[PDB]
Amino acid sequence: TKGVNVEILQDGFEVALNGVVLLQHTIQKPMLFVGHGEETIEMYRGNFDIKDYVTERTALRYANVEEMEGAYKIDLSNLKNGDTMLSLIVKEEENRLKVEYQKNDANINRFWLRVAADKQEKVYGCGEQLSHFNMRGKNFPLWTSEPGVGRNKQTYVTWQADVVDKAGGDYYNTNFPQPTYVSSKKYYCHVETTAYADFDFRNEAFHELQVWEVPKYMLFETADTYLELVEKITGLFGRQPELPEWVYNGVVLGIQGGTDVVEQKLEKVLAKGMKVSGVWCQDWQGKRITSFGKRLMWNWKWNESEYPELDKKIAEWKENDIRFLGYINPYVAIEGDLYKEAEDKGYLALNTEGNTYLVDFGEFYCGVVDFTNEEATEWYKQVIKENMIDFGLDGWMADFGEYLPTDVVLKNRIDAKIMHNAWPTMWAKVNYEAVSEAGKLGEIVYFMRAGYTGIQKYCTLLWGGDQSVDWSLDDGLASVIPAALSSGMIGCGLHHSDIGGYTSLHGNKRSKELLMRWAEMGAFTPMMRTHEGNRPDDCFQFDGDEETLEHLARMSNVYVTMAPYIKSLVEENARRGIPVQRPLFMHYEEDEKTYDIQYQYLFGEDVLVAPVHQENQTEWEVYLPEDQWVHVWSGEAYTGGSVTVQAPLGYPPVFYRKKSIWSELFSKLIHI
Amino acid sequence: KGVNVEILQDGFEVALNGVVLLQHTIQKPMLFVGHGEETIEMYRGNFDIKDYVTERTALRYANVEEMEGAYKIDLSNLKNGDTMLSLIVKEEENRLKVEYQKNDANINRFWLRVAADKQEKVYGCGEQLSHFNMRGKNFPLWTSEPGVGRNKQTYVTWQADVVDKAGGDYYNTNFPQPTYVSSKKYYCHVETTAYADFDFRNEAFHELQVWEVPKYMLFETADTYLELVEKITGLFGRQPELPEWVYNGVVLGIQGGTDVVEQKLEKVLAKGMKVSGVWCQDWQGKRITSFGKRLMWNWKWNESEYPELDKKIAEWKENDIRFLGYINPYVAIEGDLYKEAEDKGYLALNTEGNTYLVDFGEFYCGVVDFTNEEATEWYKQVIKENMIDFGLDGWMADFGEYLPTDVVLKNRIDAKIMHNAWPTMWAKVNYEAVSEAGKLGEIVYFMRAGYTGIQKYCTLLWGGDQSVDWSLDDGLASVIPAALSSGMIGCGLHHSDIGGYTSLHGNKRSKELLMRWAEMGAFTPMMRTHEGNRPDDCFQFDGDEETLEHLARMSNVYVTMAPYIKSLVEENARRGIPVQRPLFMHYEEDEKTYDIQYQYLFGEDVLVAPVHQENQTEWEVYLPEDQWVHVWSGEAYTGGSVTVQAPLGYPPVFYRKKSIWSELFSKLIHI
Ligand SMILES: *[C@@H]1[C@@H](N)[C@H](CS(=O)(=O)O)[C@@H](O)[C@H](O)[C@H]1O
Ligand SMILES: *[C@@H]1[C@@H](N)[C@H](CS(=O)(=O)O)[C@@H](O)[C@H](O)[C@H]1O
Ligand SMILES: [K+]
Numbered sequence A: 001t002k003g004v005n006v007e008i009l010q011d012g013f014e015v016a017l018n019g020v021v022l023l024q025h026t027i028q029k030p031m032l033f034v035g036h037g038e039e040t041i042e043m044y045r046g047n048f049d050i051k052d053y054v055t056e057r058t059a060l061r062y063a064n065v066e067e068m069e070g071a072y073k074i075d076l077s078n079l080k081n082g083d084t085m086l087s088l089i090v091k092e093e094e095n096r097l098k099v100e101y102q103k104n105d106a107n108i109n110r111f112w113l114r115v116a117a118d119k120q121e122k123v124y125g126c127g128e129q130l131s132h133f134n135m136r137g138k139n140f141p142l143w144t145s146e147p148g149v150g151r152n153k154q155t156y157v158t159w160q161a162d163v164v165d166k167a168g169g170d171y172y173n174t175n176f177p178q179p180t181y182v183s184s185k186k187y188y189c190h191v192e193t194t195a196y197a198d199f200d201f202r203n204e205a206f207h208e209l210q211v212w213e214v215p216k217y218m219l220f221e222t223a224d225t226y227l228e229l230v231e232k233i234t235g236l237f238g239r240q241p242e243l244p245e246w247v248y249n250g251v252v253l254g255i256q257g258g259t260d261v262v263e264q265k266l267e268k269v270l271a272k273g274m275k276v277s278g279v280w281c282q283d284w285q286g287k288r289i290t291s292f293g294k295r296l297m298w299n300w301k302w303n304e305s306e307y308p309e310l311d312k313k314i315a316e317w318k319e320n321d322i323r324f325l326g327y328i329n330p331y332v333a334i335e336g337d338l339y340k341e342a343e344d345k346g347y348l349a350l351n352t353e354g355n356t357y358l359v360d361f362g363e364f365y366c367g368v369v370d371f372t373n374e375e376a377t378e379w380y381k382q383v384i385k386e387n388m389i390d391f392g393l394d395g396w397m398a399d400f401g402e403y404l405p406t407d408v409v410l411k412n413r414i415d416a417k418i419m420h421n422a423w424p425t426m427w428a429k430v431n432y433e434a435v436s437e438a439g440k441l442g443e444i445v446y447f448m449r450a451g452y453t454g455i456q457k458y459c460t461l462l463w464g465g466d467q468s469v470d471w472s473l474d475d476g477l478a479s480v481i482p483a484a485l486s487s488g489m490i491g492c493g494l495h496h497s498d499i500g501g502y503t504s505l506h507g508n509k510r511s512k513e514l515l516m517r518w519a520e521m522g523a524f525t526p527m528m529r530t531h532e533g534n535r536p537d538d539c540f541q542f543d544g545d546e547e548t549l550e551h552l553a554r555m556s557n558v559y560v561t562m563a564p565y566i567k568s569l570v571e572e573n574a575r576r577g578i579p580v581q582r583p584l585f586m587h588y589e590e591d592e593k594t595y596d597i598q599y600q601y602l603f604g605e606d607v608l609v610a611p612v613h614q615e616n617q618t619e620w621e622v623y624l625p626e627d628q629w630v631h632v633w634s635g636e637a638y639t640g641g642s643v644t645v646q647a648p649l650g651y652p653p654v655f656y657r658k659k660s661i662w663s664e665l666f667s668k669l670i671h672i
Numbered sequence B: 001k002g003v004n005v006e007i008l009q010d011g012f013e014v015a016l017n018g019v020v021l022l023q024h025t026i027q028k029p030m031l032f033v034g035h036g037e038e039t040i041e042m043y044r045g046n047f048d049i050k051d052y053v054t055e056r057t058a059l060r061y062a063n064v065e066e067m068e069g070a071y072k073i074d075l076s077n078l079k080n081g082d083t084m085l086s087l088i089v090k091e092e093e094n095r096l097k098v099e100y101q102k103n104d105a106n107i108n109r110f111w112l113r114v115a116a117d118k119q120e121k122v123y124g125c126g127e128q129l130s131h132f133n134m135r136g137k138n139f140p141l142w143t144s145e146p147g148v149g150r151n152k153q154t155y156v157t158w159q160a161d162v163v164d165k166a167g168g169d170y171y172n173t174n175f176p177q178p179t180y181v182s183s184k185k186y187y188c189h190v191e192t193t194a195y196a197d198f199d200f201r202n203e204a205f206h207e208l209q210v211w212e213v214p215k216y217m218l219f220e221t222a223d224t225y226l227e228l229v230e231k232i233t234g235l236f237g238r239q240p241e242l243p244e245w246v247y248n249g250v251v252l253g254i255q256g257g258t259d260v261v262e263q264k265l266e267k268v269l270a271k272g273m274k275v276s277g278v279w280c281q282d283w284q285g286k287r288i289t290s291f292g293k294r295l296m297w298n299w300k301w302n303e304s305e306y307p308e309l310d311k312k313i314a315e316w317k318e319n320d321i322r323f324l325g326y327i328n329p330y331v332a333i334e335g336d337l338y339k340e341a342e343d344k345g346y347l348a349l350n351t352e353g354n355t356y357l358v359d360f361g362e363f364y365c366g367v368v369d370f371t372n373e374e375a376t377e378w379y380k381q382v383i384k385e386n387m388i389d390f391g392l393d394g395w396m397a398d399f400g401e402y403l404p405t406d407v408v409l410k411n412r413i414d415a416k417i418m419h420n421a422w423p424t425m426w427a428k429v430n431y432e433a434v435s436e437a438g439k440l441g442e443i444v445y446f447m448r449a450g451y452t453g454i455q456k457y458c459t460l461l462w463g464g465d466q467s468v469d470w471s472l473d474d475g476l477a478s479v480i481p482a483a484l485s486s487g488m489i490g491c492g493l494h495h496s497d498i499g500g501y502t503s504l505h506g507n508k509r510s511k512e513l514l515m516r517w518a519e520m521g522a523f524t525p526m527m528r529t530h531e532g533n534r535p536d537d538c539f540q541f542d543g544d545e546e547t548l549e550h551l552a553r554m555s556n557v558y559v560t561m562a563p564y565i566k567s568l569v570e571e572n573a574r575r576g577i578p579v580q581r582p583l584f585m586h587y588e589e590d591e592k593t594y595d596i597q598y599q600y601l602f603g604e605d606v607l608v609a610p611v612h613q614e615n616q617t618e619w620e621v622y623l624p625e626d627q628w629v630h631v632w633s634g635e636a637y638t639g640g641s642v643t644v645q646a647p648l649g650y651p652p653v654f655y656r657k658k659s660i661w662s663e664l665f666s667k668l669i670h671i
């Protein structure tokens, strides 16, 4: 009943952990398949066209099981007797089910495991998912990439993104895939691989996990509660630090265009009472105009012409309690000194001809710093220590990580088809080690959009990457909510988004209303930060008018008022890996409706948030689970059920539990 | 000569007349078998088809045995394993024939690799509307609505998908066929009616996927493309000669009743237009939907909408004007034919045992079950009684592509196999009604759907519904590869709606497009117009004097050329050499001609390069090495790329000086 039971039946066998039956094999219903495929992968500016051609897929119907020193060895073939094509070790290790896999045949480069399932089972995770929190009913390729603009082939924006740039994407695309899912049966499954995989949840009777290698091993672990499960899952993958205290001082203002403009906007905003934690100037190292809009010069050193006197102003701003954040990514532009330095030292990834591999990022080309080369890794970390940390940055956006082409040649001589998905975590580790080795862990925060297994430790803060500046479900304001939920279930519990979104293309322009609604949601997350977007002049900004400025100021005061509670949530995330933004089922397991909600979240245990994610709304339907709730703005009391509440601009549908030990604090929001 | 099977060290090679076709080694196996679980969703003739392949087994090991003059080949996954596929390879007629037998009932997926070269081109697979040379892509073969737009990059396609799930893609067609022709001068035919997918993406082999183990395949070589198409029509069959009356000029598409027919006829005759007949698709009744002006699907003269038609038909015949109607293989629920069929049990059923009702778009119809011989004879009698005896000289025989995969048929064969068979069965109904009435060569019907065997049963193809636009994938141009592809697999009579059909998603037919389309139509077996789905949104042939005069002129071009066109139609009947021919069919040595699909040879002696783009005054044309004469100017040209003026009324058309018809073609200078 406890631990790993392998029951041998006449048909075949069953593997169970703590009585939860996970793996079921019979001759008639086999659980494992192996085969061969020849894939075509075309990259274009971070977008991947991936087609497989499967030449063989073989059902391993016949199993021989041997009981051994606590462990089981199972040999599998296509025919009764038959040569062994796959060999399993099934064991309990550190209280988990562990299944190790060993193949004989070098031709085998395709693997499929079926895990038993029910009609009603729901599945969550697979990294940051932007369209579907509950993944049941679809299949999810797991390949880090540009997530897509629009992400739904039915919309005009997606269509145009495909037509013009091959960039529309689809429901499964993400910067942060992960071969790890959580089941409503209260276990998680992890496949240890960095190869392409595709988790297929279309079949009622089983989930099928495809991998483009035979994975070294899988881990399963069960739990009694979702709270316990996520604690165990962060036990495996790791836990994020507490955010620096200064984050709680208010909004990180996204401002570009030089020192003078930053100073003037900081003063204008402070005067209107906005609470500011810091200013984030992504163009500190230099701007770069393309047809896409205002981008950046990818050379990670202060640009004295564009940002005069930044060295002095940073310290000046610090003495007024205003921190400074910059920008870096793992690539270096050909025009810059860092590219030149790297090339001379041999720190860049190579092509088959033995020269620098140059990647198209969109009207400019850059080298890839080869993080498989430990010397190059140390070099890039010194670049961070010297040009960012010592220069007095309190943080930065650590962008990208998803653009490794499958035809690069790396120092470690491992195939790029296997290194591609590993890159985000390697990129994270670089940031983590630079910060840690400088003794700034807990004081400097960087934020990343890309990920893979293990950023649970190495990434100090996620953001949702580039959303469209619109109200679409698949790439607008709403898409952030499943993004936070999904990422929390697999152990990344600190999440935020660009206030206003980023991507202005194909006729999408950011409206005033959208910016305000986005600030409303942002105040009920770990960090409020704004972004000018790709085309600042085409998007409404926070200083676009007095009403907007005052709206953001008000929401900044909401966040700061809640700071003590949010801190407690961030400390719980650090201690037990319980995410800041939680799915409703995590606290209402017995409520069937909560397993399919993805546009509401619990902000800690005691607050329910249901952001207005549609245009031109004055009221909003909310589902409340059975508890005693208080609408934060009105003080009106509600028990469980669907309710409509008024939600004018500035008054997001947010509720707190009357039983909260924080009720005194939440009551202060009536008067703001 | 004939079939040599060489046994090599690691496998075998099968050759026919020295063309090596099949190559099997343990390392490079040619046959794979497996299991799949498919999902097929139908919506108004559009099919979403996804496969889930659970097994695919490489049959690496072959044991070859002699016999009669046949060779028996047993194939397995392991050396001396259980035999999973068994072949008989033999010469029959003068063809390579490969018969296949499986043991295991679980096997429902089959893949044959046939050896290929880097530079090989492949043609056919039925009527292909986007790609004549299919090399470099894969082609599902499942009869369906062909798509509106047919290219995901265009606005029209995008909207067709968003609103109606109807955009389709490059491979969609009403007339797929599991038959291709290789530039190595052989054709390959897979005898199946199951879903198939011919994959030409690999340099070293073509892969033919079938969702069953096919009974057999046939290969045949030839020395020339002319001989190849003769042999291929030798297998599948040959079309009759068209009726003499077709060559009297344009078949006018007119709707809206007897009086409107008379008024249009008078206006057009007075402007000197040569008219062969009138085609009134609403003779049995109209039906308005949100789609536009459609039809009431009950195949009997509608006395209210077409008063006195019985008398006018004979009157028009005395003025040398024939009459054409419309039928399809479905019956509308509101009509008497539906009621009759239901009572007699002639309709296809659902799993609950009742009439299967198919959504055709805002209306529902029953499917006449041609697997029921009694129902077949019944529908043929309906044609004899209501159409032939009523005095129709022809008709559009529409549709054939909408058999749902969950229908239940009298013969109790799975609809996944009967779906692709339906077009040919539908054709056979038309053929037998006409043949049994002794009217073959006097009555002509035209169809858009097809499968293996309409080479005999379909008297005339048309390209179906094109968009009323200039797009390559669904506009005027799309017709040309459609005719070429169809000719290579033995359907040598092809035409299109003059003006196209589909007005949707902002597409409206312009004057210019109608004129350019008439220009191409004059250099095809039949000139016929169509009002389109929304007649008031499309420019018509009587839209203005310039247009009427343009069509009159083009009608005179066609009639002047009638003797030549007749000869072409006679050659198609005798030897199966198609009326519209790829340039490589007469210039085998010219490498550029194997990739041209927007030009054709109209018989041996005329090259046509239709202007298929808007607002053009001139057009670049590729001419192979010969002595050519621009039809309109008399200017002479030898081989190469050349630009010629092509104002409206003056399509880029050339004839060979050497032609025994040069006297006739000279008359076009003055017309
Ligand atoms: C990454 C990147 N798209 C932007 C920088 S740029 O230099 O590539 O333009 C950032 O502004 C985005 O926020 C981030 O997603
Ligand atoms: C078939 C069909 N689409 C039309 C008739 S209707 O009643 O379905 O509208 C014909 O007008 C079309 O030419 C033919 O493709
Ligand atoms: K995006």
Ligand SMILES: [K+]
Pocket: B146, B147, B148, B149, B465, B466, B467, B474
């Ligand atoms: K079409």
